[PDB]
Design an enzyme around this catalytic site. Sequence first.
Site, PDB file in Angstrom:
ATOM      1  N   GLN A  17      49.290  36.893  41.651  1.00 55.63           N
ATOM      2  CA  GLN A  17      49.689  37.414  42.957  1.00 55.63           C
ATOM      3  C   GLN A  17      48.741  38.506  43.417  1.00 55.63           C
ATOM      4  OE1 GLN A  17      51.608  38.340  40.298  1.00 55.63           O
ATOM      5  NE2 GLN A  17      52.046  40.529  40.453  1.00 55.63           N
ATOM      6  N   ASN A  52      43.184  46.167  48.643  1.00 53.33           N
ATOM      7  CA  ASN A  52      42.648  44.837  48.891  1.00 53.33           C
ATOM      8  C   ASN A  52      41.684  44.836  50.067  1.00 53.33           C
ATOM      9  OD1 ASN A  52      44.505  44.319  46.901  1.00 53.33           O
ATOM     10  ND2 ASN A  52      45.872  43.088  48.179  1.00 53.33           N
ATOM     11  N   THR A  76      51.416  49.850  34.231  1.00 50.75           N
ATOM     12  CA  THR A  76      52.508  49.071  34.843  1.00 50.75           C
ATOM     13  C   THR A  76      52.898  47.834  34.024  1.00 50.75           C
ATOM     14  OG1 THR A  76      51.042  47.822  36.352  1.00 50.75           O
ATOM     15  CG2 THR A  76      51.924  49.897  37.120  1.00 50.75           C
ATOM     16  N   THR A 116      49.629  35.397  34.453  1.00 48.53           N
ATOM     17  CA  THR A 116      48.919  34.180  34.832  1.00 48.53           C
ATOM     18  C   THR A 116      47.496  34.469  35.286  1.00 48.53           C
ATOM     19  OG1 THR A 116      49.184  32.081  35.995  1.00 48.53           O
ATOM     20  CG2 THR A 116      49.473  34.068  37.281  1.00 48.53           C
ATOM     21  N   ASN A 118      41.947  49.637  38.998  1.00 44.86           N
ATOM     22  CA  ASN A 118      42.869  49.984  40.072  1.00 44.86           C
ATOM     23  C   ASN A 118      42.872  51.480  40.352  1.00 44.86           C
ATOM     24  OD1 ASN A 118      44.582  47.457  40.931  1.00 44.86           O
ATOM     25  ND2 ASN A 118      44.222  47.297  38.722  1.00 44.86           N
ATOM     26  N   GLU A 146      20.430  34.808  43.140  1.00 44.34           N
ATOM     27  CA  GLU A 146      19.666  36.036  42.974  1.00 44.34           C
ATOM     28  C   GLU A 146      20.485  37.117  42.272  1.00 44.34           C
ATOM     29  OE1 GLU A 146      16.562  36.632  43.697  1.00 44.34           O
ATOM     30  OE2 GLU A 146      15.955  34.910  44.924  1.00 44.34           O
ATOM     31  N   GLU A 156      54.427  31.504  40.199  1.00 39.46           N
ATOM     32  CA  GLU A 156      55.673  31.858  40.848  1.00 39.46           C
ATOM     33  C   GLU A 156      55.472  31.850  42.356  1.00 39.46           C
ATOM     34  OE1 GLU A 156      58.645  32.440  39.279  1.00 39.46           O
ATOM     35  OE2 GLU A 156      59.475  32.356  41.308  1.00 39.46           O
TER      36      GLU A 156
HETATM   37  N1  LIG Z   1      43.439  45.255  42.603  1.00 39.44           N
HETATM   38  C1  LIG Z   1      44.720  44.939  42.774  1.00 39.44           C
HETATM   39  N2  LIG Z   1      45.534  44.775  41.674  1.00 39.44           N
HETATM   40  C2  LIG Z   1      46.837  44.456  41.827  1.00 39.44           C
HETATM   41  C3  LIG Z   1      47.372  44.285  43.088  1.00 39.44           C
HETATM   42  N3  LIG Z   1      48.678  43.976  42.936  1.00 39.44           N
HETATM   43  C4  LIG Z   1      48.976  43.942  41.616  1.00 39.44           C
HETATM   44  N4  LIG Z   1      47.839  44.247  40.919  1.00 39.44           N
HETATM   45  C5  LIG Z   1      47.658  44.333  39.462  1.00 39.44           C
HETATM   46  O1  LIG Z   1      48.426  43.373  38.770  1.00 39.44           O
HETATM   47  C6  LIG Z   1      48.726  43.899  37.495  1.00 39.44           C
HETATM   48  C7  LIG Z   1      49.972  43.265  36.900  1.00 39.44           C
HETATM   49  O2  LIG Z   1      49.823  41.867  36.824  1.00 39.44           O
HETATM   50  P1  LIG Z   1      51.113  40.951  37.087  1.00 39.44           P
HETATM   51  O3  LIG Z   1      52.173  41.765  37.788  1.00 39.44           O
HETATM   52  O4  LIG Z   1      51.639  40.458  35.761  1.00 39.44           O
HETATM   53  O5  LIG Z   1      50.602  39.746  38.028  1.00 39.44           O
HETATM   54  P2  LIG Z   1      49.812  38.469  37.454  1.00 39.44           P
HETATM   55  O6  LIG Z   1      48.424  38.848  37.002  1.00 39.44           O
HETATM   56  O7  LIG Z   1      49.752  37.389  38.488  1.00 39.44           O
HETATM   57  O8  LIG Z   1      50.685  37.876  36.246  1.00 39.44           O
HETATM   58  P3  LIG Z   1      52.172  37.307  36.443  1.00 39.44           P
HETATM   59  O9  LIG Z   1      52.969  38.224  37.336  1.00 39.44           O
HETATM   60  O10 LIG Z   1      52.835  37.166  35.096  1.00 39.44           O
HETATM   61  O11 LIG Z   1      52.082  35.953  37.090  1.00 39.44           O
HETATM   62  C8  LIG Z   1      48.902  45.392  37.694  1.00 39.44           C
HETATM   63  O12 LIG Z   1      48.335  46.099  36.617  1.00 39.44           O
HETATM   64  C9  LIG Z   1      48.141  45.686  38.967  1.00 39.44           C
HETATM   65  O13 LIG Z   1      47.053  46.529  38.690  1.00 39.44           O
HETATM   66  C10 LIG Z   1      46.564  44.447  44.202  1.00 39.44           C
HETATM   67  O14 LIG Z   1      47.036  44.298  45.327  1.00 39.44           O
HETATM   68  N5  LIG Z   1      45.233  44.775  44.042  1.00 39.44           N
HETATM   69  N1  LIG Z   2       3.358  41.267  52.684  1.00 41.78           N
HETATM   70  C1  LIG Z   2       4.676  40.973  52.778  1.00 41.78           C
HETATM   71  N2  LIG Z   2       5.440  41.034  51.659  1.00 41.78           N
HETATM   72  C2  LIG Z   2       6.763  40.752  51.705  1.00 41.78           C
HETATM   73  C3  LIG Z   2       7.354  40.362  52.990  1.00 41.78           C
HETATM   74  N3  LIG Z   2       8.661  40.143  52.761  1.00 41.78           N
HETATM   75  C4  LIG Z   2       8.888  40.356  51.440  1.00 41.78           C
HETATM   76  N4  LIG Z   2       7.759  40.730  50.815  1.00 41.78           N
HETATM   77  C5  LIG Z   2       7.633  41.020  49.369  1.00 41.78           C
HETATM   78  O1  LIG Z   2       8.008  39.847  48.647  1.00 41.78           O
HETATM   79  C6  LIG Z   2       8.925  40.134  47.598  1.00 41.78           C
HETATM   80  C7  LIG Z   2      10.179  39.294  47.811  1.00 41.78           C
HETATM   81  O2  LIG Z   2       9.952  37.943  47.412  1.00 41.78           O
HETATM   82  P1  LIG Z   2      10.502  36.737  48.327  1.00 41.78           P
HETATM   83  O3  LIG Z   2       9.377  36.038  49.033  1.00 41.78           O
HETATM   84  O4  LIG Z   2      11.518  37.275  49.303  1.00 41.78           O
HETATM   85  O5  LIG Z   2      11.183  35.692  47.313  1.00 41.78           O
HETATM   86  P2  LIG Z   2      10.924  34.108  47.459  1.00 41.78           P
HETATM   87  O6  LIG Z   2      11.446  33.626  48.789  1.00 41.78           O
HETATM   88  O7  LIG Z   2      11.673  33.392  46.361  1.00 41.78           O
HETATM   89  O8  LIG Z   2       9.454  33.790  47.336  1.00 41.78           O
HETATM   90  C8  LIG Z   2       9.218  41.619  47.674  1.00 41.78           C
HETATM   91  O9  LIG Z   2       8.608  42.279  46.561  1.00 41.78           O
HETATM   92  C9  LIG Z   2       8.581  42.123  48.949  1.00 41.78           C
HETATM   93  O10 LIG Z   2       7.855  43.326  48.690  1.00 41.78           O
HETATM   94  C10 LIG Z   2       6.456  40.323  54.165  1.00 41.78           C
HETATM   95  O11 LIG Z   2       6.882  40.011  55.295  1.00 41.78           O
HETATM   96  N5  LIG Z   2       5.170  40.633  53.981  1.00 41.78           N
HETATM   97 MG   LIG Z   3      51.818  37.118  38.732  1.00 42.34          MG
END
Ligand SMILES: Nc1nc2c(ncn2[C@@H]2O[C@H](COP(=O)(O)OP(=O)(O)OP(=O)(O)O)[C@@H](O)[C@H]2O)c(=O)[nH]1
Ligand SMILES: Nc1nc2c(ncn2[C@@H]2O[C@H](COP(=O)(O)OP(=O)(O)O)[C@@H](O)[C@H]2O)c(=O)[nH]1
Ligand SMILES: [Mg+2]
EC number: 3.6.5.-
Lengths: 428, 428, 49, 426, 426
Positions: B11, B219, B170, B136, B197, B245, B62
């Site tokens: 959830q 979130n 929790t 889960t 968290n 990348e 659930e």
């Molecule tokens: N980052 C984040 N964590 C959340 C949020 N809501 C709940 N949690 C985390 O969920 C954890 C508890 O997990 P559960 O309540 O068991 O939920 P679950 O992972 O789906 O497992 P079940 O409830 O058994 O199905 C808590 O420690 C919270 O930190 C949220 O909105 N954001």
């Molecule tokens: N001379 C020049 N160098 C560039 C330019 N754009 C990116 N670079 C250099 O190229 C590198 C990025 O590689 P990139 O060409 O983007 O990856 P690729 O597409 O997989 O070949 C970096 O180190 C930059 O400094 C540009 O317009 N001119």
């Molecule tokens: Mg759950």
Amino acid sequence: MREVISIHVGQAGIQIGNACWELFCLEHGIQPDGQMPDAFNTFFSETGAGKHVPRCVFLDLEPTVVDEVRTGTYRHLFHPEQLISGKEDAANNFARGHYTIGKEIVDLSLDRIRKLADNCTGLQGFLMFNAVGGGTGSGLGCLLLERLSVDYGKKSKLNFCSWPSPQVSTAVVEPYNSVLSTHSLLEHTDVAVMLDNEAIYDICRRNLDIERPTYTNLNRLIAQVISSLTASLRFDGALNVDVTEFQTNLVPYPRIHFMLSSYAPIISAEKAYHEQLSVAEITNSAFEPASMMAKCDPRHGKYMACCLMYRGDVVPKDVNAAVATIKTKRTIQFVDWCPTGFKCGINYQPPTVVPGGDLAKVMRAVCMISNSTAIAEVFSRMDHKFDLMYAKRAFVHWYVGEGMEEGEFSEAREDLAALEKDYEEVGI
Amino acid sequence: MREVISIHVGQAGIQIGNACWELFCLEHGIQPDGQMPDAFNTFFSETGAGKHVPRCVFLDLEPTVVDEVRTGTYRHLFHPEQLISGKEDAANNFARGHYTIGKEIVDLSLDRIRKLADNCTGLQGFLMFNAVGGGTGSGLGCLLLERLSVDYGKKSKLNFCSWPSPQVSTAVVEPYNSVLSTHSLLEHTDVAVMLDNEAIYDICRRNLDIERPTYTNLNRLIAQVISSLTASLRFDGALNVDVTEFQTNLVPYPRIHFMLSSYAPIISAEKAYHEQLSVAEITNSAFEPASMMAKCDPRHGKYMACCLMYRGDVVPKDVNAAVATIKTKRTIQFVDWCPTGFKCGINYQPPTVVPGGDLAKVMRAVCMISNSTAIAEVFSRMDHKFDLMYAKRAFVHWYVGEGMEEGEFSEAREDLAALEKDYEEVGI
Amino acid sequence: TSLHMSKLVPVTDLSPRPSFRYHADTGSLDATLLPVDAVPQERIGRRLI
Amino acid sequence: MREIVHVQGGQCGNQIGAKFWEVISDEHGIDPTGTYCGDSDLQLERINVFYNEATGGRFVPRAILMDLEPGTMDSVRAGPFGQLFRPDNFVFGQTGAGNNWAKGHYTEGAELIDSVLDVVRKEAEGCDCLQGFQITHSLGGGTGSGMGTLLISKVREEYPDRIMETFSVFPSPKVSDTVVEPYNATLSVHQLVENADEVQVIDNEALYDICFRTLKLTTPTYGDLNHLVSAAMSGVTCCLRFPGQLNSDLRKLAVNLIPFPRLHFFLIGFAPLTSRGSQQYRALSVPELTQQMFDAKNMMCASDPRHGRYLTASAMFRGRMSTKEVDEQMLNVQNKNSSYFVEWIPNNMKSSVCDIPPKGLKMSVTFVGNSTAIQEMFKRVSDQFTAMFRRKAFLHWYTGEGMDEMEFTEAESNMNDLVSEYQQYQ
Amino acid sequence: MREIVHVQGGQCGNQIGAKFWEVISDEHGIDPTGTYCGDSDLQLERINVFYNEATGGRFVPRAILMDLEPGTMDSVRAGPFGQLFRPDNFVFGQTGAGNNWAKGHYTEGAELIDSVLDVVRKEAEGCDCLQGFQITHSLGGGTGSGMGTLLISKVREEYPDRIMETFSVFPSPKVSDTVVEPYNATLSVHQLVENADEVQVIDNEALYDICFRTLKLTTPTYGDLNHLVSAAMSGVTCCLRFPGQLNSDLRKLAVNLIPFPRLHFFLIGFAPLTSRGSQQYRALSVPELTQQMFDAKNMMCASDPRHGRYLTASAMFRGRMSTKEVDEQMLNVQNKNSSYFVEWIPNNMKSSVCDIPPKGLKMSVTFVGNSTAIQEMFKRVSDQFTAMFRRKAFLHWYTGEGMDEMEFTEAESNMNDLVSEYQQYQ
Ligand SMILES: Nc1nc2c(ncn2[C@@H]2O[C@H](COP(=O)(O)OP(=O)(O)OP(=O)(O)O)[C@@H](O)[C@H]2O)c(=O)[nH]1
Ligand SMILES: Nc1nc2c(ncn2[C@@H]2O[C@H](COP(=O)(O)OP(=O)(O)O)[C@@H](O)[C@H]2O)c(=O)[nH]1
Ligand SMILES: [Mg+2]
Ligand SMILES: Nc1nc2c(ncn2[C@@H]2O[C@H](COP(=O)(O)OP(=O)(O)OP(=O)(O)O)[C@@H](O)[C@H]2O)c(=O)[nH]1
Ligand SMILES: Nc1nc2c(ncn2[C@@H]2O[C@H](COP(=O)(O)OP(=O)(O)O)[C@@H](O)[C@H]2O)c(=O)[nH]1
Ligand SMILES: [Mg+2]
């Protein structure tokens, strides 16, 4: 010109045709009186100055459903002599529907399909909608194939069979009716597919996400898959193939004519919102093993031949691209002796939506008929259920005293068993 | 073309991702019903009549948080099967989410992940957000990685751990849940970022001078971090720094893939009036030890690679001048085998703020992902706590009686001890 | 066909799709003579009276 | 006649090579839609050096553009003076090389190099008789350093006789992003020395020196760096495109600047370079133009030439100018700075006169020197690279892509003897 | 004069004539209403080649559009320019042979063949002496491959001394529709090799390959693939109706491209085929268009010619040209690419310059190359046949209606000796 005649044996067959013909009325734009306000000629004849009548015959022994079609809103859509009803039920008896109370109604229905066939030349075949476990659908179904095959010996037949489903059966003696039906189904039909009820039930449970539909909701899906199958016969398309090509492209041996089916998409109003239904998407979903219409997992089977009907705004490139990605996929397994196992026909006219039903307006869709070696376990469980029931004469005494001798049961056993050995020897 | 698939387990993952896609919709001008009144392709999928659907699987055992999304304003944005749930929670157990109750959900999580990732080739990777201290988030959070590693192997896997605080818990079984999951993400996660968290609690109290922020306010800062991290993918810039990348320039060995995070400026309207956000001072505030988002103190740790995500109207000659000032500063220290330790990237779109949130309007920002040897203390406070559960069998029967065997507590503890030895020998 | 009648070339106007927001082409502040391309700038000094 | 197939590699070479095409369209009187404007005979009588007619009277560049990700070549194509190139001359990559030499060379770059070799053979074989290739790339990135120099190794072998010039930007010592800088630099050079007969180095930190100290730009963007090197690459190829009193192509420069085939790395400088506040104050005379040219503050490579020794140098003059003032100022700087010139080659310096100056300038010089002072920066990136390999720096993503460890030590072994060879001519 | 009698078999044949007749009618300046406009002598100077006078001033094509399903020529008649044909030349089948070679060739199509034979000799004998018959069809379906080669078989006997011009669309390797592809293809090719004087091989995805990779078509339909081959028919018969510096006809191709009678299967390229992004960027001359001709990416047969040697080659040049460069531009492609030509024929060439181009273009080319590259296509339809045939695939219809097991065995013997002969000449 060209026409094709449908026959509807059994209550299940007539209710499948009930959703079928109301769907075709929407497709050709005819009202239930038959009168419009020339693509309809393969399902409808002419009558008077604008009426059309379907080339269908509604054949049961029970009058409680056939007379209920006459009394209902679709009365004058059908010619009244095309709806033939009997006197009393076969009542889940293959003996009653084939021998005793069938002889007075097969000759009457044969006259009606005689007068329906000679009206024009160019017939492709017949479309028989029937069930398997029912006494009427197996009994009159057996005798109708027996009479139509011996005189129309060069015309195709399309036995759409509602085969019994694995988990639910909603009948007791229905494994007896299924083995006896395939005793005569093998040598008399040309193309048959299996439409198991809970495979369709599963489809409408996780695609529609409706959990208590009714019979009419499934019959709309069967109506949609018949309409998508025969849309090549009616509407012009870029690549059109019809009943003659089915009889020569999907049944490589004369005795393997059992196929599966699927559709894609089957989506509700809310599920049409959140995806575009690309051609590649509606081919992967149609090829999903959970999407088949026979509870028939192809994961432990090998595909043998395949056919897909793309309907709507489909373009001929991504039909090739979706087929190419299916070839690359390893989960779908083909057979060694068929390197090119794909057939398709593309059409422009999209599948219509019944207003008040459950489908959604889609730009494109996919019909499916696929022959594979995966029906072996579908009939091997009909073997197993028939074994412990035919151990010590369960319900046999009323089939053997009421029309057949004991021994037709044994003959139906090696006829279905030789179909299992046929399915085994093709793959290996 | 390209896209990245978001994953959100637990959830904490659901409501972090609620703030993330609230930022992504507001960035691309997407209404919560989908229609915009082609840079969106990185996160949204074009479909139908110009509407867009997020690519984010929502997994939680659930439904107490996910059907709140199904009844909130963001219900016609996501597909209903894009948000998936079982019936019963894991109730703070790794063994529940990995051995007993996570099966009926994970088989359809992979069913949806296959049809979300086949949309377009050239997919970058996955961005999972998990709560490692929970049930889960640790359990199904673990189990999903063996499935993604064995199926989608070579593709990049990003993980954002909601790291438990050194003193704020929790939960009392969170040393069991965190050890058993950090043991598995060590070899199943390509890039992992710790997000403590309390580290976000004190950064809203200091840099925003807000004294009552909550889970949703936490979130929003996490969403701002992930939006700037992917801002190269979604917007043009002088130096584009895509997902590959991050790997090649931050993580030096397959084991040492834990990295800290920091975001600066995070300033309310009280102080944004008074401060000018020069490049030199937004990277001094990014590099200051109070601005770490892990409660991982870097004065006694040795940096070796820092990614700098400049986001706004930033000329690169201020970047090259500012990182030179960071090099000359002696309060920080770099390891001997990295005279070069910066990977800067420039994005031209300034980061937007939500109307009514706690961030004031901003002209340029820095999102830092840094790899240092300071992470030994946030795993050694782990080491001392989990040892004193293990001394006399604290809460063991809630794991061993539910699928796993006693002994994986020892196997996961010694694996993290090898992580401590690995971090010690690199830093010398 | 999407081609022309006798020309073997497409005839469908244009169906393009740009990728990004696509501005800030780095307007160079050096003309062909390369001086600085001076605009009125900040002087950085005291109060000139 | 004599043509140069221009080649761009990496996102650097796309955006500093694109700048080369509107600074060469400006001297040639080319409207950005491709038409001609300016009714001058001697602009167009050498136009086949870089352009081809397209049966409609328009000119398309002989440019081949490479990148493994389509973002930066979208920026080149749809920008101003960037629709001039043919779209087929663009070649797209999909996965992208993530700043690593291994993926750009072996795994991903092999499937893209076959389309590039088809189109560069399409351009070269189509015309009558080529003159050479120009190569604009980078050594800090992955696609410009790996796939670009893999192109250099293949184009050496079908066409061995012709000249293969590169304008390459090397990793900067002080300022440094893209933390695998010494790997992409060393792995380029160790086989760049054998498949390229002429390589000219630009340092970005020297480009910051020239824009801060002499131009006095308050906020120099990348466009000033792209344009200054564009004036450098235009001045070298001046005599191919416009007539001069003293004719010299870059083959003539190749003979006259390297005495041994192993050493072929050059310094580039450009003059004059003044601010707007000094634009109409400085005198534009040959004595002032050459004393501004011999300046480390004027240099575009970050090695101080006073610390080493100029082996041989050259100055491509541009503009209608008196001619023995060209000669006698070269003897003036030689006889005054006698310690900064090598003694066993009398009169180390070369000049040629290109009679047409760049637009808006009366006089201008580009300077191609060959100093042993550049061993400062070859050795300093060798000391960085030996700090990497001595403790296994990022090695798994340089060994898992179909290549092994032994060519890393091979890359150092045939690079420290380049520093040693320069040491024994110092 | 010399007149071509056109026959279209199958759904592929009727659609491919529903684009070729348009591209040849506007070349003659004919309206869909049959009335000429264009006030040129050269268009009407040979119109009897492909048309017949109707004693009303309007010209009717000498075509016979024909198959066994009525939906194909109803869509032709409803479509634009489809009115030009006679309903008398249209012959109708109603039941249809569905993807079936055997009942197309023996039972169903032989019922229709005695009436379409009536209409083909009426277009044949109606002039003083015909040049030949042009039959366009495909080898994948039933009515176009089974009974399509039935009419190829029978026109051999009453008309032996006149040429047999055929276009055949061969099955696709990786994605093929019409599941029985090799049973239709191999059982047709034996009647197609001793009853046809020259056959041109067109492949479906190679038409797609030209669309996606050289035309850069985002949306190709069947009409876009159909233009590519309609330009191939227009170029190969252009010099019959339209003058030139060097004449060429169908027997001109036949006697120079076939050295040995059992091999007459031809590759086709068409140039120029420009992506419209670079249409305004591409020069149009002979020394640039000849390597577009000799190119794998411009091949509407999906065989790489680099996997074989050109046995004989020819090129129907068209346009206002220079008929010196007609021929040293292919002298260049012979003395550079020496290995890509056979050795025991010196001087493998035929240029055929025709003066009048297609409208607008100043240059165009159809290319006819008899090469051993088609070996890969014949082997591939062979093992796809034999993998099916070893396990009795899809055959009980074919045997049950007037064929037997014996006929398929010599179908693979004269398939296999085509490969064995091409290795004799390799
Ligand atoms: N980052 C984040 N964590 C959340 C949020 N809501 C709940 N949690 C985390 O969920 C954890 C508890 O997990 P559960 O309540 O068991 O939920 P679950 O992972 O789906 O497992 P079940 O409830 O058994 O199905 C808590 O420690 C919270 O930190 C949220 O909105 N954001
Ligand atoms: N001379 C020049 N160098 C560039 C330019 N754009 C990116 N670079 C250099 O190229 C590198 C990025 O590689 P990139 O060409 O983007 O990856 P690729 O597409 O997989 O070949 C970096 O180190 C930059 O400094 C540009 O317009 N001119
Ligand atoms: Mg759950
Ligand atoms: N798909 C579908 N199946 C049906 C429908 N109606 C009945 N069935 C199937 O038919 C079986 C019941 O037997 P029926 O087909 O009705 O029997 P019958 O063919 O009418 O033969 P009798 O009962 O003797 O008249 C059930 O197992 C159902 O699965 C229907 O409307 N749609
Ligand atoms: N060139 C072209 N090929 C087509 C067309 N329609 C179908 N095809 C190809 O030809 C095959 C079907 O042949 P078809 O026309 O049905 O043969 P027929 O049944 O004998 O008339 C398919 O596999 C397609 O790949 C078309 O309009 N043009
Ligand atoms: Mg019943």
